[PDB]
Amino acid sequence: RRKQHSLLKRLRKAKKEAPPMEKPEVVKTHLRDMIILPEMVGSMVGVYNGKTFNQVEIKPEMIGHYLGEFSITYKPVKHGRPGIGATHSSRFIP
Amino acid sequence: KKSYTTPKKNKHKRKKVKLAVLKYYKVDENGKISRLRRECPSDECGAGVFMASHFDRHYCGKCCLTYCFNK
Amino acid sequence: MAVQISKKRKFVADGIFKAELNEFLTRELAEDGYSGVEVRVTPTRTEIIILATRTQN
């Protein structure tokens, strides 16, 4: 416990106060590191990427893993149309 | 490297309100001095300073991490 | 006051003292006709012979 204190109290707290048969709002984090645990389950957590808080519901099937595996931090990728110098042919103009 | 882009908030440091000073000692008759709330009990405190009358919270401002009664 | 560093490291630390001084002085005695130094440790005493042309200034 190196001031993971801040997270684990908010989760239990928000889970308690929330109506029955309804999930809480969110607790947010810039921390992408913390083991998913049984007690954490049922909460909803937003996880900072570089700008964006991608929200996720915690399953009992996610236990053992980290938070940061369920939020990506890049666009998967598309292409493309090779550019100009994209080879030993691009050159000349005047 | 390039110049700062516009915010829509920024505010620096609060002005730490311009309260009237020393009414903490009450005079109704002399030589009597009618003290209000208790003066701070720590060894490192001088006990010449007042404690906050901050009810539902009771806190020495000379202290800055310790000695917070609340009842 | 001990112990004492390795013989290899003994020469390096002497070189660092010889060099740092020689650029410290050059930034103050430039107008006085600086020309170098010559250090000598002697029995229970340091000598730092501050060579310059005009000892007056």
Binding site: - | - | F11, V12, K18, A19
Partner: protein
């Protein structure tokens, strides 16, 4: 003011610093260097070395 200004630097390339001005990038330790390779050259004449090979 603030309650922080620092965070653990205890190992790595940021907890040692080289003697140019507190320059880096140019990772250096050798035989008790703490001395920057660009200036090491300028101290070839100065004492520590004279070039012979």
């Amino acid at each position: 003011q603030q309650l922080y200004w620092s965070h653990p630097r205890k190992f790595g390339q940021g907890s040692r610093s080289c003697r140019v001005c507190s320059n880096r990038h140019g990772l250096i330790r050798k035989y008790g260097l703490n001395m920057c390779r660009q200036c090491f050259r300028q101290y070839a004449k100065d004492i520590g070395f004279i070039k012979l090979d």
